[PDB]
Amino acid sequence: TGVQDCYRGDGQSYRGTLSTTITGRTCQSWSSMTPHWHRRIPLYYPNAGLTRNYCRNPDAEIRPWCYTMDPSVRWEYCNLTRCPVTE
Ligand SMILES: O=C(O)[C@@H](Cc1ccccc1)[C@H]1CCNC1
């Protein structure tokens, strides 16, 4: 058996609710500008599902990511694995 939650391709299609980074930090809400001010917002990325603080990939990084709630760490890849391509 595989995982319950995972991304496919580069994860631009990911619409799950994972909200922690590879180091366990909490993702910052996309609509919030604190601790990090940014432009990965629906104004610029209207198709990308930038909702709550869920891991997403609006700008075609290699895998899903988020800004973090740690003021010293702007962004990280999320703690999300790639869905098995095969059985
Ligand atoms: O830090 C950011 O907001 C951007 C890059 C950026 C830095 C400075 C100015 C504009 C863009 C990253 C987040 C993950 N993908 C690109």
Author numbering: -4 to 82
Give excerpts from the publication.
Crystal structure analysis showed that LSN3353871 interacts with the KIV8 amino acid residues Glu56, Asp54, Tyr62 and Arg69, illustrating the specificity and binding modality of the molecule. The structural data with LSN3353871 revealed a molecular interaction between a key motif made up of an aspartic acid (D) residue, any amino acid (x) and a glutamic acid residue (E) (DxE motif) in KIV8, so we focused on the presence of these motifs in plasminogen. Notably, in apo(a), each KIV repeat from KIV5 through to KIV8 contains the DxE motif. In an in vitro Lp(a) assembly assay, LSN3353871 disrupted the formation of Lp(a) with a half-maximal inhibitory concentration (IC50) of 1.69 µM (n = 43). Oral administration of LSN3353871 to mice expressing human Lp(a) resulted in dose-dependent increases in the circulating levels of LSN3353871 and dose-dependent decreases of up to 78% in the levels of Lp(a), with a median effective dose (ED50) of 14 mg kg−1 twice daily (BID) within five days of dosing. In cynomolgus monkeys, administration of LSN3353871 (20 mg kg−1 BID for two weeks) resulted in a decrease of up to 40% in the levels of Lp(a). These data provide a proof of concept that a small molecule that binds to the lysine-binding domains of apo(a) can inhibit the formation of Lp(a) in vivo.
Lipoprotein(a) (Lp(a)), an independent, causal cardiovascular risk factor, is a lipoprotein particle that is formed by the interaction of a low-density lipoprotein (LDL) particle and apolipoprotein(a) (apo(a)). Lp(a) is a lipoprotein particle that is formed by a two-step process involving interactions between a LDL particle and another protein, apo(a). The goal of our research was to develop a potent and selective orally delivered small-molecule therapeutic to inhibit the formation of Lp(a) by blocking the first interaction between apo(a) and apoB to reduce the circulating levels of Lp(a).
